Every structure is written in structure tokens, then in C-alpha cells.
Chain A
Amino acid sequence: NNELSPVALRQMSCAAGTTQTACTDDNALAYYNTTKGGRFVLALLSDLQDLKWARFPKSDGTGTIYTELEPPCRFVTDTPKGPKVKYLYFIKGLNNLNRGMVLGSLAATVRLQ
């Protein structure tokens, strides 16, 4: 029948912060949807509890865009790390279908308790 996400898209390491240039360097699990008209990453995942800004340099390098995110999404994961209590952020304005695909791939290939 109607399926959520036949073949999802994947991961990147990116920079974030709480606003403005609180942007540090690298710090976030940026789950990407790459379409060849520019990479529109979908999800942020983090072990920094409250991020409000993220930032990715444009492909030309002279520009660099900031991305504002929702409240966190609490959860806990299984791995050799033991449990991992981590926090998830949807770029505000993310429509329900993109949240759907992201959470789908998450609860599919991510250990969680």
C-alpha cells in the first residue's frame, strides 16, 4: 500500500550552536536529502541538548547559511556506547512527510530503547 520511505538518504557531519556565531565547528549528525539542485539536509541529531542554530557553508564557499531548528526530540539508543540519551532537531518548517521519512529511517536502522 502507501509506503513511507522507499529508499532513504543519509548522513553528514556539520556545525551548530545556540544562535548566531555560537556556531562552533563540527558537532551534529546532519541527515541529508541530497538532490542535485543543492543539498537539502533534513534532520539534526546531537549530543548537545539545546541547539537553535546550525550552519553549512555554501558550495561556492563565499556564503554560509544558518538553519533554525525545532525544540529537541529526546530519545535513548543502544550500542557499544551502552545507552545514549540523545536529542533530535527538525529544521523548523519541516513538513510532516520529511519528519516521516527521517523518523522512519531512524527507527529502522537506529538502536533505541
Chain B
Amino acid sequence: AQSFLNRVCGVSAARLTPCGTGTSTDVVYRAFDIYNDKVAGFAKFLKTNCCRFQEKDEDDNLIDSYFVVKRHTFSNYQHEETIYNLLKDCPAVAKHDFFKFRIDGDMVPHISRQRLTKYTMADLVYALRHFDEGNCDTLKEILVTYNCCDDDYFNKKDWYDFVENPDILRVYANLGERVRQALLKTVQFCDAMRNAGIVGVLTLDNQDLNGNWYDFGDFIQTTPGSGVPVVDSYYSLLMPILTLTRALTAESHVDTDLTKPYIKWDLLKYDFTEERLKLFDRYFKYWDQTYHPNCVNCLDDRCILHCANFNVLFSTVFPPTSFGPLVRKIFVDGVPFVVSTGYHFRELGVVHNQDVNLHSSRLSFKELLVYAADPAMHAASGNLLLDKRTTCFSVAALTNNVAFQTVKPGNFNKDFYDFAVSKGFFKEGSSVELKHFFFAQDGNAAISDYDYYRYNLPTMCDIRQLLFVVEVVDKYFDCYDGGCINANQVIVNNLDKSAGFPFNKWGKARLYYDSMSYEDQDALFAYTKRNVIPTITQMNLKYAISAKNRARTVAGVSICSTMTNRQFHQKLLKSIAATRGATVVIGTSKFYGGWHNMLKTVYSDVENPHLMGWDYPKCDRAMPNMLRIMASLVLARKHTTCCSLSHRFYRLANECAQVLSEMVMCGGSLYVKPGGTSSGDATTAYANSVFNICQAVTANVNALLSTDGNKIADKYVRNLQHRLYECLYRNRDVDTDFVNEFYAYLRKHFSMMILSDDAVVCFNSTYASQGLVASIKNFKSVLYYQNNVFMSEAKCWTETDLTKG
């Protein structure tokens, strides 16, 4: 009757109100991370086996603390009670109460978990990794319950956007330490099990948003001191949220206390190798995979991705003046230079050049080059600069006055216009009308465009899913061949183009491709497999017709970077542009029936074909650094014979130091680039294609894993989903047979046509209707949590009639 409540709330503040109806359970729709031989996935199910009573405060106002009493088999009763009794003393275990109540002539046992919360961490993770601005009720509720905002914030519609309303981050960051507290308690819990000798798998949906744990129905016992928690799906599903909410922001504070001043690090310190290990051991103690703070010690490209993922997170703690080239005073001809002998990447840690020498008699052409290209001598000998127009970390002002570059208007071709209106054009109410012009720009147009790099935030990636998506994406690139080429095999169409800074003072690229013999070029190339050459990048405005008055800007990369990137990549790049019928359609012309062939190829044999196309908002400036690194690592997977392992790492490091986190020379001043692609580097149109395929693949993974496995009817796709979950979160090395099988499934039901971030998809309509391939909401969610942009469905098109492509 009602004595049930007086029994549930047992000895502690009986301010309970039923939520169900007497003694019957209360069903809810909540996100579970479940795997057990009949279904795997991370999806919203319907919970049915819990009566739920909410505590009220004094004042008879309702408080966010519930008593959740579960009903089950009489053994699971004693099993869970044994394990709890072994585990009760941990501060991170919600208080349980096991009792038996008789409904009729049946002493049925209940397990009452006390004072828990409305939503568990899985609801937070799901709500942020499956965002849908039409249906975000639980996210609004989580946000207002913990005083991150207040419901009138959601009348500011466009609140969820990252580009519009960039204040949303300040809102999400208010969950930060809450999340951080959870992490801490997890470690405690792990230690608890490892002492009590309990073996089990931790899932995110068994821990409320205070931090406490419950649900021991699937744990077992071993000899104490030798228990083992399994925390792969927990940490890796949670990873994208640690940088979204900035969980670790309480680590730059004097004693990890948010009410204390910032730590004032020594300016000259750059190592931070012990700090990263202490952070890893404080938060990810039981993550059982070696973490190399400096990725020089990594073993392959997958270990590099793994450890750079953690560096991405741990580098948001350390002062931003400690990244970038590490200079040093060398003596050449008895005169002291300051030159760069290393680098400190936010993703790769500290990297030291191998061939640095102090007393050199005279410089060669190659050394003159690699010293005129370094930003070291340039920045060291310029005025300090505090540019309060942007938020990007300015560095120096190589001049005495800022340069304000404008854009002119286009010239009018009056004769063609008069002729066009003679033939009866431009009449009022016609359909064809002028919309493309030359928009002029005022002085502060260059930097006000560079400032868009403020849309590039530190994004941590789901590592156990990225490590599978990289295998599938690499499988998309098996048809080609690549490797290093000698200096006499590279091809440079149009040698008369600018050579970057400072080389553009003395001549175009022709001068530097003429003055260095093939042996000089080859020595320079083989130098960058043992050393890091940081370079500068100019930012240039474009003068071209367009339909929108936003200024455009391209990154003029120095000749010292292109000259070597060409030799590293050109064999593969030209084997991509010379293949027909593939997924990447760079190089395929549209004339002479190229268009018809491309479309008939993308419509390969898909059974209920629809066509779909999306759009990446600010693709080049919002691209996370982990995905740029993955793109370059996929492009460098063809060097398995030409290059050694240290050579491949040092080429990757040169790529990052030159076209990822380089020093941009805008106006007349050196600023730091936070991340994202430089649009004028040697491999942009192909790195963009790799990134495009990566996002499409992960959209498919998310769409298949987040589906109620019990409702899938095709008993092959169910087993494919089960195997996919295992291959992500249970396996640790590649499973080439299943990689091939997923790639075949994708090519069957989700064929693509990819140019450098432009894409068409012919997909099986009746699968996407059942959530077995990516729809467009899946792309929206994926870009939200893995790209920090909101993709409005006004830029994505869909077409249901194939006879109009």
C-alpha cells in the first residue's frame, strides 16, 4: 500500500513523493550503453524495472535526488548484496538498501539505491553526441538543473549554435567541474574494485551526475587485491565531452581549486612531460594502454593517434606561450644566431632536431634557406605586439606600422552589358538576374578574416572509434600507390607563383627552383626527415567574383615547405588524380561525358537510391587538429618501404609545424595559428577528401550503433552491429576481415562521390529510414560533437528522383 514508501525511505529523511503509482514500476526513456549477445550499442532504450520516488526539500519544494528501487530475481538480490557489502566503504558508491516487501503472498525483494539523480552520465553523453535542436529536451533539463543557464536562455533561439552565439561554450563549461568530479570518483571506484577483487565492466550509465556508482548485477569476485575494472567504453565514449565542457579547467589553478589564482608557470619552461604523466595518472589511471607524452616514442601511426589524443586534452592546461619553436643561440662565423632547434606541439609534445650544430664556419645555400625561413630570427628581432583586434595569440610586429590592405571593386564591361540589354536581358521580373559581383573590402578586412580562427577549439576525439574509422578510411585508399620521389621527378606547373615569406622579396618560385640543383633539393628533403623546419605563412586576400560580401583569403605557404611536401606526396597525389571510377573524383574531367560517367558510377547499384548532399560550415577553420593529423597519417601510409619510422614521424612533425599550427604573417605581423587547414598548402584538396570520408564513415558508425538492436529485422545487420561494437570497444588490434566487411557494406548501401569537401551520396533509402546508414541528422550530430559547428538543414539537400541528379 503506502507503507512501501515509508519502507523505501527507511531511516533517512522520509520526504519522498511517489513518481509511479503505488508499488508499480516507472518506465522511462533513457540512454544505455549495452552489450550482451542479443544487442550491442549506445542507444536510448525504455527502462521498466524501477520504482522511483523523488525527495522533496523542506518548504515542500522538490529537490533533485531520487530513490530508485529495483525489483528482480531473488538471486541477483544476494549476488548484488555480496558485492555491495564488499564495496560499501568507497565514497563513490551510492548508498544501497536491500529489503523485502510482500505485494501479495510473495515476499519480493527490492534494491533501493538512494539519493541518486534524474539523469546518469550516459544521458549527458548521449544528449551531446546525438544533438538534434528540435528534440533536445533532456539537454535543456540537464543544463537548467545544474545552474549552467536558466530557461529563458532557450528563447534566444540559435542558442545551440557555435558560430552564432559563441557564448554557448561559457554555458557548457559550467558543467565542467561537475564532469571532472565524476572522473575523480571513477578512479576511486576503480581502486575500490581492484582492492576488493571485483571484476566488471564500467559503463557510463551506471553513474549519476553527482558521481556515485551503482548496479553490480554483472560483477564477479576474485581474490582481493587482484580485481580488474574494464573502462574502455566508459572513457572513450566520454572523451568528446571532456573538451566540450572543459573539464580540466580547474587544473590551471593554484591547488586544483576554482577559487584560487592561476598557477604562474616559469616563462622559460617548455617541457611539461612530468605534468602530463601526473594528469594521466590522476584522471585516467586504469586506461590500460601505454601513454607516451612525447609522440616521438610512439610505435606506429595508431599509437600516435592514441597519444596525441591525450596530448590535445592535457595541453589546455599549460600556458600558451610555451608552444611553438624552441630556439637556441648558435654561433656561425663567430657571430650568434638564434635558430629553431625543436618544437613543442600541443598534440605531439616536445620534438628535438637531431642535426643541430653550434660553431659552423659558413652557411651553404640550403642552410641559408632553412635559416631565412625560420620565424626565429624574424620574431626575435621585431617589436612586441599586442593586437587587441583579435583573440589569436599575437607574436611580433616585423615593422614599425601596421599594414591595412583593401580590396578594389571590379571593372565594368559596359559594352557586353549594353549588348545584353539589346538582346532583351535584365528585364524586370526575369529569372536570370545579376547576383555575382566584385565586393570591395576596407582596411581591416584581412585580420577581421584571420580572426575566424577563433572558431577552432581544442577537440578531443573518441579514440576507440577514430582508430576504427581510420582503418575504414584507409581502406578507401587502397587502389593508389605512393612513396618518395627524387628531386628530378617532381612536376611544378606554373613556376611563376609567389614563394611565401620572406622569399617573395627576391623572386617567385622559379628563382628557388632554379638556384638549387637536384642534389640541393634532395639534401633539403632528406634533412626534414631528421629535423623540424618551422615556417611562416602569408595570408592573402582574393580578388574574384562571388555572391556574398565575406572576404576570402588564402594561405601563401613558403617555398621551403612546398618544395619538400611535393617530393613527399606527389607520387600518391598524382596517382589519385589519374584514377577513374573511384570514390575520390579529383582529376576526372566533366567534359566528353565525364559528368555522366561520374554519376553513373556513384549510382553503382544501390537498391532504394536517394541522393544526399551536405555542407561543412567553415570547413577549413573549424577542422579539429586531430582530424588533420589523421588525414596526413592516412596520406603517409604508402611509405612503408621508402621511409623508416622516425622519418615518417619527422615528416608528420614538419607538416604540423608548417601547415597546422604555424606562424601566420598577416598585415605586417606574426600571429599564431591555432589549427585547421592552411588552404594553400601542398596537399589541401586531398586532405580535405580524407577528412570528408572520415566524417561520413563516422556518421555511419554512429547511425548504426545508436539503433535499438532488438528492432532490426535483418538478422545479418544485427550481427554486423554486434560485431561493430566489439571491434570498436572490445578489440584492441585491427580485425581486417571485419574492416573489409564493413567497407563492403558501406559501398553497397552508401556510395559516395568526393571532391575536396564537396560530396554526393547515393544511399539505400529504406535503410536510412530505419537508421542503418547515415541520414542527415547523423551528419548534424557528428559535426556538432566532432567539429564544433552546427550544420543547418538549409544547406543540405536531398533528392528522391534519380533521373534529375
Nearest CB in chain A to that of B288: its residue: A96
Q: Which of A74, A100, A112 contacts B228 (CB under 8 A)? A: A100
B719 at the interface (CB under 8 A from A): no
When distances are taken between beta carbons in the complex, the residues of chain B under 8 Å from A95 are: 288-289, 732
Provide the bound-state CA to CA distance between A39 and B286, in Å. 27
| Count of inter-chain pairs, beta carbons less than 8 A | 69
Provide the bound-state CA to CA distance between A7 and B722, in Å. 14
Provide the bound-state CA to CA distance between A97 and B232, in Å. 9
Interface residues of A in 77-113 (CB under 8 A from B): 95-97, 99-100, 103-104, 106-108, 112
When distances are taken between beta carbons in the complex, the residues of chain A under 8 Å from B201 are: 2-4, 100
When distances are taken between beta carbons in the complex, the residues of chain B under 8 Å from A107 are: 199, 220-222
**Residue among B32, B200, B221, B223 with the highest chain A CB neighbour number at 10 A:** B223
Provide the bound-state CA to CA distance between A4 and B215, in Å. 14
A2 in contact with B218 given A96-B230, A103-B199, A104-B199 (CB within 8 Å): yes
When distances are taken between beta carbons in the complex, the residues of chain B under 8 Å from A104 are: 199, 220
5 nearest A-B pairs in the assembled complex, by CB-CB distance: A3-B36, A6-B37, A96-B288, A2-B203, A2-B201
Asked whether B226 lies within 8 Å of A73 as measured between CB atoms, the reply is yes
- Say how far B186's CB is from chain A's closest CB, in angstroms: 14
B80 at the interface (CB under 8 A from A): no
Q: Which of B35, B222, B288, B732 contacts A3 (CB under 8 A)? A: B35
Asked whether B229 lies within 8 Å of A75 as measured between CB atoms, the reply is no
When distances are taken between beta carbons in the complex, the residues of chain B under 8 Å from A6 are: 36-37
When distances are taken between beta carbons in the complex, the residues of chain A under 8 Å from B732 are: 95, 97
Provide the bound-state CA to CA distance between A34 and B200, in Å. 23
Given contacts A95-B288, A103-B199, 19 further A-B contacts (CB under 8 A): A1-B34, A1-B36, A2-B34, A2-B35, A2-B203, A3-B36, A3-B201, A4-B201, A73-B226, A74-B223, A96-B229, A96-B231, A96-B232, A97-B732, A100-B200, A104-B220, A107-B220, A107-B222, A108-B220
Q: Which of B33, B34, B199, B286 contacts A4 (CB under 8 A)? A: B199
When distances are taken between beta carbons in the complex, the residues of chain A under 8 Å from B33 are: 2
B233 at the interface (CB under 8 A from A): yes
B730 at the interface (CB under 8 A from A): yes
When distances are taken between beta carbons in the complex, the residues of chain A under 8 Å from B199 are: 4, 99-100, 103-104, 107
B594 at the interface (CB under 8 A from A): no
Asked whether B215 lies within 8 Å of A103 as measured between CB atoms, the reply is no
- Say how far A83's CB is from chain B's closest CB, in angstroms: 14
When distances are taken between beta carbons in the complex, the residues of chain A under 8 Å from B233 are: 2
Listed A/B pairs (24) with beta-carbon separation below 8 Å: A1-B36, A1-B203, A1-B217, A2-B36, A2-B201, A2-B218, A3-B36, A3-B37, A4-B199, A4-B218, A6-B37, A7-B37, A73-B223, A73-B226, A95-B732, A96-B288, A97-B232, A97-B732, A99-B199, A99-B228, A100-B199, A100-B230, A104-B199, A112-B223
When distances are taken between beta carbons in the complex, the residues of chain A under 8 Å from B221 are: 107
Provide the bound-state CA to CA distance between A74 and B229, in Å. 19
- Say how far A6's CB is from chain B's closest CB, in angstroms: 4
Give the number of residues in A that approach B within 8 Å (Cβ atoms).
Answer: 20
Interface size class on chain B is 20 to 34
A interface footprint on B189-226 (CB within 8 Å = 1, 0 otherwise) = 00000000001110100100000000101101111001
**Residue among B35, B36, B199, B289 with the highest chain A CB neighbour number at 10 A:** B199
Provide the bound-state CA to CA distance between A75 and B226, in Å. 11
**Residue among A4, A73, A104, A107 with the highest chain B CB neighbour number at 10 A:** A4
- Say how far B585's CB is from chain A's closest CB, in angstroms: 35
Asked whether B37 lies within 8 Å of A96 as measured between CB atoms, the reply is no
Asked whether B223 lies within 8 Å of A1 as measured between CB atoms, the reply is no
When distances are taken between beta carbons in the complex, the residues of chain A under 8 Å from B286 are: 96
Asked whether A1 lies within 8 Å of B32 as measured between CB atoms, the reply is yes
Q: Which of B36, B220, B232, B289 contacts A103 (CB under 8 A)? A: B220
Provide the bound-state CA to CA distance between A80 and B730, in Å. 37
Asked whether A4 lies within 8 Å of B200 as measured between CB atoms, the reply is yes
Asked whether B220 lies within 8 Å of A4 as measured between CB atoms, the reply is yes
Provide the bound-state CA to CA distance between A106 and B289, in Å. 24
**Residue among B36, B203, B222, B730 with the highest chain A CB neighbour number at 10 A:** B222
Provide the bound-state CA to CA distance between A7 and B200, in Å. 16
When distances are taken between beta carbons in the complex, the residues of chain B under 8 Å from A73 are: 223, 226
Provide the bound-state CA to CA distance between A75 and B223, in Å. 7
A interface footprint on B36-74 (CB within 8 Å = 1, 0 otherwise) = 110000000000000000000000000000000000000
A interface footprint on B468-489 (CB within 8 Å = 1, 0 otherwise) = 0000000000000000000000
- By a beta-carbon cutoff of 8 Å, the part of chain B in contact with chain A is 32-37, 199-201, 203, 206, 215, 217-218, 220-223, 226, 228-233, 286, 288-289, 730, 732
When distances are taken between beta carbons in the complex, the residues of chain B under 8 Å from A97 are: 230, 232, 730, 732
When distances are taken between beta carbons in the complex, the residues of chain B under 8 Å from A3 are: 35-37, 201, 218
Provide the bound-state CA to CA distance between A15 and B174, in Å. 58
- Say how far B262's CB is from chain A's closest CB, in angstroms: 36
- Say how far A86's CB is from chain B's closest CB, in angstroms: 11
**Residue among A7, A75, A103, A107 with the highest chain B CB neighbour number at 10 A:** A103
- Say how far B47's CB is from chain A's closest CB, in angstroms: 11
- Say how far A4's CB is from chain B's closest CB, in angstroms: 6
Nearest CB in chain B to that of A36: its residue: B737
B interface footprint on A9-37 (CB within 8 Å = 1, 0 otherwise) = 00000000000000000000000000000
Provide the bound-state CA to CA distance between A96 and B234, in Å. 13
When distances are taken between beta carbons in the complex, the residues of chain A under 8 Å from B215 are: 1
When distances are taken between beta carbons in the complex, the residues of chain B under 8 Å from A103 are: 199, 220, 222, 228
- Say how far A63's CB is from chain B's closest CB, in angstroms: 20
**Residue among A73, A99, A112 with the highest chain B CB neighbour number at 10 A:** A99
Provide the bound-state CA to CA distance between A80 and B668, in Å. 86
**Residue among B206, B228, B232, B233 with the highest chain A CB neighbour number at 10 A:** B228
- Say how far A92's CB is from chain B's closest CB, in angstroms: 12
When distances are taken between beta carbons in the complex, the residues of chain B under 8 Å from A112 are: 223
Provide the bound-state CA to CA distance between A73 and B322, in Å. 46
Provide the bound-state CA to CA distance between A108 and B223, in Å. 13
When distances are taken between beta carbons in the complex, the residues of chain A under 8 Å from B289 are: 95
Provide the bound-state CA to CA distance between A74 and B222, in Å. 10
Provide the bound-state CA to CA distance between A106 and B199, in Å. 11
- Say how far B300's CB is from chain A's closest CB, in angstroms: 15
Nearest CB in chain A to that of B204: its residue: A2
When distances are taken between beta carbons in the complex, the residues of chain A under 8 Å from B220 are: 4, 103-104, 107-108
When distances are taken between beta carbons in the complex, the residues of chain A under 8 Å from B34 are: 1-2
Provide the bound-state CA to CA distance between A108 and B79, in Å. 13
- Say how far B86's CB is from chain A's closest CB, in angstroms: 14
Provide the bound-state CA to CA distance between A82 and B366, in Å. 79
When distances are taken between beta carbons in the complex, the residues of chain A under 8 Å from B218 are: 1-4
Provide the bound-state CA to CA distance between A97 and B35, in Å. 14
Nearest CB in chain A to that of B33: its residue: A2
Provide the bound-state CA to CA distance between A108 and B37, in Å. 18
**Residue among A75, A100, A108 with the highest chain B CB neighbour number at 10 A:** A100
- Say how far A73's CB is from chain B's closest CB, in angstroms: 6
Provide the bound-state CA to CA distance between A103 and B286, in Å. 17
Nearest CB in chain B to that of A35: its residue: B735
- Say how far B65's CB is from chain A's closest CB, in angstroms: 23
- Say how far B520's CB is from chain A's closest CB, in angstroms: 46
**Residue among B37, B201, B232 with the highest chain A CB neighbour number at 10 A:** B201
Provide the bound-state CA to CA distance between A75 and B203, in Å. 29
Nearest CB in chain A to that of B233: its residue: A2
- Say how far B167's CB is from chain A's closest CB, in angstroms: 37
When distances are taken between beta carbons in the complex, the residues of chain B under 8 Å from A99 are: 199, 228
Provide the bound-state CA to CA distance between A106 and B215, in Å. 22
Nearest CB in chain B to that of A99: its residue: B228
When distances are taken between beta carbons in the complex, the residues of chain A under 8 Å from B228 are: 96, 99-100, 103
Provide the bound-state CA to CA distance between A103 and B684, in Å. 50
Interface residues of A in 39-81 (CB under 8 A from B): 73-75
Provide the bound-state CA to CA distance between A44 and B288, in Å. 20
Provide the bound-state CA to CA distance between A1 and B206, in Å. 10
Provide the bound-state CA to CA distance between A103 and B197, in Å. 10
Nearest CB in chain B to that of A98: its residue: B732
When distances are taken between beta carbons in the complex, the residues of chain B under 8 Å from A106 are: 222
Provide the bound-state CA to CA distance between A17 and B339, in Å. 55
Provide the bound-state CA to CA distance between A74 and B231, in Å. 24
